Design a protein around this ligand. Structure first.
Ligand SMILES: [Fe+3]
Ligand SMILES: [Zn+2]
Lengths: 426, 581, 308, 61
């Protein structure tokens, strides 16, 4: 019953100069899955729309805009990078589309709307800008709207800035359609989607003296259904679940998820990302080497654990030297929560089937750039035929960001600078 | 003639928001020029779905579209204004939707009953049944206006539509329904309220979303005011009781924040049986916000209790809870309680106040937080009526003295504001012996704001203690500062004279104040010298005409020859204002 | 007629006190008037006691209002601001415009000296250029002020006993006569006596040193003692260095630093202070904290209204 | 172990490219009462361009 993933599309330049501004930094599907937002280190956001004709239509460019631009914080003598950290779509409220785009410092609410009406008509001039004699104004006429070629316009509606001392690493919308949280390294702020001049600091784990700092917030997320529950992971590998009903300030956690001896244990233990299951009963956390799935009812241990790449446990020394050990990988649930996807090195992304416990490795490479071509499972060992040696792994090729279509078996896998879209073999 | 109008119409397409905003704000002028017929056929279609979507621009348009009934030809063609407002009711921005809903409500009254069933009611059905929850959210605010006038058959349809909104899958819609549930019940028949509003009210009050349940509390108040008092126990109280015991502190906050409104709705009998136990729990709530909200209601809640058991309930059930609040760790809970705690003195009476309230009163004055102490000192009027403030004088003075000497000048500023109020309550006898030194000490404070506040405080004190008291006590000490080595303190003498002369009259200003002002005209510091010119300009009207010519004019003229530009300028201004030159 | 302009000028001061920026035409007219006054002032401007000495404000207008609420309102209180009126603040335009307006109105009451941030190059780095462009849509306002900055006196002398300057002493300068010889009507150099006077800072180390700022020199207590004795100066009041307590004596009380921007950059949380010189030259320090902002703090641990 | 408190703190202070007078002077007070900043002095040229100068993303191509 394994899904025979087939190459569908690849976007971006083919083995180009790979400028730093061209590196993809986030992939986020829409709530309905029609739109697929992509962010890069250059502050540019590209939105792809699926062809409207279960659906397996190709994704085509829909909108493009400069979400963030480089800035200099003259109050701190710091250059604010324009890299897009997280993109989060808001629930569709009208014909327009809304999403939140955040760099390390500022969150922006962007409205993407289609306009197909052109106001035509003038009194003191022509459509070409040629003015006329004002004395010839005998009868007033009102402009009319003329149909025009469809155009997509992206504009910033609200800017949420000047709230985080440290770098924002997560944004998550609340299920109440009103608020969302933004979590930096040491503080979590609660925002209102229609208010920008003030925010509520629910969580603040900053020590009184920074000399005593021992852990930082790595990720945070609201519960998909409950409006009062959110979980934020720390660099120690512990997830704290906060019930906003207990008190206004969530400094006291309702639950603490953790487990009871390598040299780099302090690093690999850090949780890169935490994702709630669609049902909300389960929670998945990604550390450097493994994926752990936690049942919210059980805190002592995870129900399931999956090893993303065991062959790199022996190479942590090399990874530390080149700083690859600090890569913050991500994890994604499928629509039915039965399969979880996470990325790896050498353009490998792993699929873990929870029901059957099966495990496959797939590669996103241009060599298979033929639509409707089955992806051959990859095996890494260090060696039989067709197996890729561990030494051959290219640690510069990191699949950090991945996204799963909320309903269908369509996954958007983002390499360093190319976005790959794969579909199930119908 | 038409050219100015052509400018406005062309600005509608202008890329500059300011020009577009200005043109839209003048649509009334544009409509008049176009005429009644042209406005319906040309202007309104252009305003239906505007390409521009600026929040301020759309908000301005919504306001204008609500006042076009006459311009579109009166009520006969008022329905032509629906499409422009229907689009605005669907926009993402909340304020624009709210204004659009307000405009729709305003023009709804101008629809005849036939029009409502033909043009307005279908609009509500479209918005209510729309696939975009922005439209459905706006539809909630339109049921109340149209329901009374539509026919019975239409009324049945509207209730069904409102029921669907209360069950909408989107929390945004449900919040809107809960907010408008109270007003929609005020127009429904009492039979339908019991049978149809209550099931919706109960369902919303138990909604999974905390943001929706907390809105049900307000609906509980409105629904209670409609039902008979005997029907509350079965229709309202079961929902209200769980709200006070709700898991979410946000819901409990609303109960505490609207407790007095609930008390006036359920009636005295229910208040004793249900609210009083609930109020105690709120004052003991684990969340500081809930306790602070409950504290504000202590005075109002106790007053409205039935006289048959007001004193007994307060002494036996409310007072013990207040004792814990006085010791509450949270600063804000203590501050909120302090501002209303002394309001219970008239209720309990003199004998009970001394034995029970007074120990808590002393504890508040000893609180470390200045705000708690300031709140107590600001609300001594109620205690004064019941028991003479002289009993509290020995305990207030240490608190006043400590505040008057606080390191933070803003704290010192606050007590100065309350000083004239306290002086009247404590009387002249106590003020002169004890508080007089504090007022003088403020005039020579390092912070200018304190000196400025003290100068104003002197004026207020004289207004109530009379001119004679000021001459004997305040004036002689104020003039002593004229010899202070610091020029800032010397200028304070002129500032004090500026305000004191306003109330001391000629009988005192000329005899005592004026000689000091003229003498200071020779101060070596130029800053003092031109304040004399400004001082004389202000007290000149009070002084008699003979005095001005004899003394003020020669001194002002001499200042006009001063080597400093500022002294010359203000000296010249004084003569011009005083008509001395 | 000068009275008509004075009444117009007074209206500007009241408008600025409300944090309302003047129009570009008004700013252009204001700067021209200021140049006529500043060009007549010496490099070492003589100041007559009593006077209140204030440090850096850095466009923190709401704190400047706090300063007046404590020191008093001009022209009642004589003030001496030691530069750095712009940059690193949300209201640089209003701050500098108000100070210039007061100088034009009350030239004899308020003295404004040049700070290291009163320069074209640095203003383009720390937001003043952006703020003028953002609040006007054009660089004319920025151009006008920057031209005016060139006429600001470098230093001030209070009764010939207290020497007030933004920065510190210079290796090339040994007596006040050398300072008067400088041509200050130019952009702030990156080297030389004019740069040092605005960039130099005191330090515990002895003699001269390398300034971490990348400009100016770091001078020890040895230089300060020599400079005071040579010129017969009782004290050397200065600014340009953040001090947590608002004022900080150093070099055996030969040099005092005054910083008048509380909670510098809205994050340092420091105290601000202003040194008040009595009629007899006695110095008194008044520390103060940032004024309460309306609808602040931006990030609050108290539940906001929308969530309540 | 290669982690620790200082390991986290250094990651918080990403870049530290430019010297800041505020941070430098705050540190001095703490030290006297009991890296701090970069060495480069910011220059207008070093700052981002006054206006955007970035082309459309190659993904949109
Ligand atoms: Fe400086
Ligand atoms: Zn400075």
């Amino acid at each position: 019953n394994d899904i025979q993933w087939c190459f569908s599309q690849v976007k971006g330049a083919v083995d180009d100069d790979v400028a730093e501004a061209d590196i993809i930094s986030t992939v986020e599907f829409n709530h309905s899955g029609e739109l697929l937002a992509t962010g890069d280190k250059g502050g540019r956001v590209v939105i792809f729309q699926q062809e409207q004709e279960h659906s397996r239509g190709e994704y085509n460019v829909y909108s493009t805009f400069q979400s963030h631009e480089p800035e200099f914080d003259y109050l701190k003598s710091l250059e604010i990078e324009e890299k897009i950290n997280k993109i989060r779509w808001l629930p569709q409220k009208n014909a327009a589309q809304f999403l939140l785009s955040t760099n390390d410092k500022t969150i922006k609410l962007w409205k993407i709307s289609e306009r197909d009406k052109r106001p035509e008509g003038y009194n003191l001039k022509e459509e070409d800008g040629r003015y006329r004699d004002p004395t010839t104004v005998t009868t007033l006429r009102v402009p009319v709207f003329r149909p025009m070629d469809l155009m997509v316009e992206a504009s910033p509606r609200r800017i949420f800035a000047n709230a985080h001392t440290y770098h924002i690493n997560s944004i998550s919308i609340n299920s109440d359609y009103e608020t969302y949280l933004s979590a930096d390294d040491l503080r979590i702020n609660l925002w209102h989607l229609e208010i920008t001049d003030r925010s509520f600091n629910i969580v603040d784990i900053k020590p009184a003296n920074m000399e005593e700092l021992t852990e930082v917030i790595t990720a945070a997320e609201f519960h998909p259904n409950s409006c009062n529950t959110f979980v934020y992971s720390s660099s120690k590998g512990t997830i704290r679940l906060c019930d906003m009903r207990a008190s206004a300030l969530c400094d006291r956690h309702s639950k603490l998820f953790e487990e009871p001896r390598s040299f780099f244990s302090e690093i690999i233990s850090s949780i890169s990302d935490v994702k709630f299951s669609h049902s909300g009963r389960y929670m998945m956390t990604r550390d450097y080497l493994s994926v752990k799935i936690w049942d919210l009812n059980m805190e002592n241990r995870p129900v399931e654990t999956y090893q993303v790449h065991e062959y790199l446990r022996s190479k942590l020394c090399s990874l530390y030297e080149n700083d690859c050990i600090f890569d913050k990988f991500e994890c994604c649930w499928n629509g039915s929560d039965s399969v979880v996807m996470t990325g790896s090195y050498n353009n490998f992304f792993r699929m873990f089937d929870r029901n059957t416990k099966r495990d496959i490795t797939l590669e996103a490479s241009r060599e298979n750039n033929k639509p409707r071509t089955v992806l051959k499972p990859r095996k890494v060992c260090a060696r039989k035929k067709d197996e890729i040696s561990v030494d051959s792994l290219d640690f510069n090729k990191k699949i950090l960001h991945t996204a799963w279509h909320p309903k269908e078996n369509i996954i958007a896998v983002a390499t360093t600078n190319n976005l790959y879209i794969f579909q199930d073999k119908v | 003639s038409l050219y100015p109008i052509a400018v406005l119409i062309d600005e509608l397409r202008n890329e500059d928001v300011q020009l577009r905003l200005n043109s839209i704000k003048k649509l009334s002028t544009i409509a008049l020029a176009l005429g009644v017929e042209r406005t319906r056929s040309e202007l309104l279609p252009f305003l239906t779905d505007t390409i521009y979507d600026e929040d301020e621009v759309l908000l301005a348009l919504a306001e204008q579209l609500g006042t076009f009934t006459t311009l579109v030809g009166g009520p006969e063609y008022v329905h032509c204004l629906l499409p422009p407002l229907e689009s605005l009711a669907t926009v993402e921005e909340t304020v624009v939707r709210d204004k659009a809903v307000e405009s729709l409500r305003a023009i709804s009254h101008e629809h005849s009953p036939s029009d409502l069933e033909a043009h307005f009611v279908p609009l509500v059905k479209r918005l209510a049944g729309g696939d975009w929850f922005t439209s459905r959210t706006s539809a909630c605010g339109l049921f109340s206006v149209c329901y009374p006038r539509v026919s019975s058959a239409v009324k049945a349809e509207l209730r069904q539509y409102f029921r669907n909104l209360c069950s909408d899958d989107t929390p945004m819609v449900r919040r809107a329904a809960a907010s408008k549930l109270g007003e929609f019940a005020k127009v429904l028949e009492l039979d339908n309220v019991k049978s149809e509003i209550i099931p919706m009210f109960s369902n919303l009050a138990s909604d999974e979303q905390d943001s929706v349940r907390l809105l049900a509390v307000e609906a509980c108040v409105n629904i209670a005011q409609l039902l008979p008092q005997e029907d509350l126990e079965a229709l309202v109280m079961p929902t209200l009781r769980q709200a006070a015991e709700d898991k979410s502190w946000r819901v409990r906050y609303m109960v505490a924040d609207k407790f007095t409104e609930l008390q006036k709705a359920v009636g005295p009998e229910i208040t004793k049986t249900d609210l009083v136990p609930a109020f105690q729990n709120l004052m003991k709530d684990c969340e500081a916000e809930v306790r602070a909200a409950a504290s504000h209601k202590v005075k109002e809640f106790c007053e409205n209790l039935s006289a048959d058991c007001r004193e007994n309930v307060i002494m036996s059930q409310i007072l013990p809870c207040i004792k814990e609040l006085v010791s509450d760790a949270n600063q804000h809970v203590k501050s909120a309680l302090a501002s209303v705690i002394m309001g219970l003195s008239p209720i309990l009476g003199k004998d009970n106040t001394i034995e029970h309230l007074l120990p808590l009163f002393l504890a508040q004055l000893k609180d470390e937080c200045p705000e708690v102490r300031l709140n107590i000192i600001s609300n001594l009027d109620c205690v004064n009526e019941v028991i003479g403030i002289r009993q509290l004088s020995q305990s207030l003075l240490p608190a006043i003295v400590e505040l008057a000497e606080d390191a933070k000048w803003r704290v010192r500023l606050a007590i100065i504001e309350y000083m004239p109020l306290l002086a009247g309550q404590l009387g002249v006898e106590f003020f002169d012996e004890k508080l007089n030194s504090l007022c003088m000490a403020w005039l020579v404070d390092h912070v200018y704001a304190i000196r400025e506040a003290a100068t104003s405080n002197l004026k207020k004190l004289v207004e109530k203690f009379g001119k004679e008291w000021a001459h004997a006590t305040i004036i002689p000490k104020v003039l002593a500062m004229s010899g202070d080595p610091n020029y800032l303190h010397r200028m304070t003498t002129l500032f004090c004279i500026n305000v004191l002369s306003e109330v001391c009259g000629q009988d005192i200003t000329t005899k005592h104040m004026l000689p000091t002002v003229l003498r200071m005209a020779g101060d070596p510091v130029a800053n003092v010298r031109f304040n004399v010119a400004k001082s004389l300009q202000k007290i000149g009207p009070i002084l008699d005409n003979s005095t001005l010519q004899s003394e003020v004019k020669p001194i002002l003229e001499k200042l006009t020859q001063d080597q400093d530009v500022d002294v010359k300028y203000f000296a010249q201004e004084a003569l011009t204002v005083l008509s001395l030159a | 007629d000068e009275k008509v302009f004075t009444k117009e000028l007074d209206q500007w001061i009241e408008q600025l006190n409300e944090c309302k920026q003047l129009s570009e035409s008004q700013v252009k007219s204001l700067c021209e008037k200021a140049k006529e006054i500043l060009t007549k002032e010496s490099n070492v401007q003589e100041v007559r006691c009593p006077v209140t000495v204030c440090g850096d404000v850095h466009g923190q207008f709401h704190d400047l209002m706090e300063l007046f609420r404590i020191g008093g309102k001009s022209p009642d209180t004589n003030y001496l601001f030691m530069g750095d009126y712009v940059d690193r603040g949300y209201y640089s335009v209003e701050t500098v415009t108000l100070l210039v307006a007061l100088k034009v109105r009350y030239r004899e009451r308020i003295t404004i000296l040049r700070g290291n941030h009163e320069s074209r190059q640095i203003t383009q780095v720390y937001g003043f250029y952006d703020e003028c462009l953002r609040k006007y849509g054009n660089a004319n306002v920025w151009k006008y002020f920057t031209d005016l900055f060139d006429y600001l006196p470098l230093t001030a002398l209070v009764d010939g006993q207290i020497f007030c300057l933004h920065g510190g002493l210079s290796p090339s300068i040994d007596t006040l006569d050398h300072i008067r010889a400088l041509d200050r009507l130019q952009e702030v150099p990156h080297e030389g006596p004019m740069c040092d006077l605005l960039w130099s800072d005191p330090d515990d180390r002895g003699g001269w040193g390398i300034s971490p700022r990348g400009a100016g020199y770091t001078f020890g207590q040895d230089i300060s003692e020599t400079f005071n004795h040579a010129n017969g100066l009782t004290l050397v009041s200065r600014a340009h260095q953040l001090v947590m307590e608002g004022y900080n004596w150093c070099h055996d009380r030969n040099v005092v630093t005054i910083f008048s921007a509380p909670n510098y950059c809205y994050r340092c949380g420091n105290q601000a202070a202003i040194m008040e010189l009595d009629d007899t030259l006695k110095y008194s320090f008044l520390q103060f904290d940032p004024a309460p902002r309306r609808g602040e703090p931006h990030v609050t641990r108290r539940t906001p209204d929308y969530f309540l | 172990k290669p982690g620790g408190s200082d390991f986290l703190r250094k990651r918080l202070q990403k870049g530290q490219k430019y010297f800041d007078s505020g941070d430098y002077n705050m540190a001095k007070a703490k030290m006297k009462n009991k890296e701090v900043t970069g060495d480069h002095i910011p220059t207008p040229q070093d700052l981002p361009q006054r206006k955007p100068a970035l082309v459309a993303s190659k993904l949109a191509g």
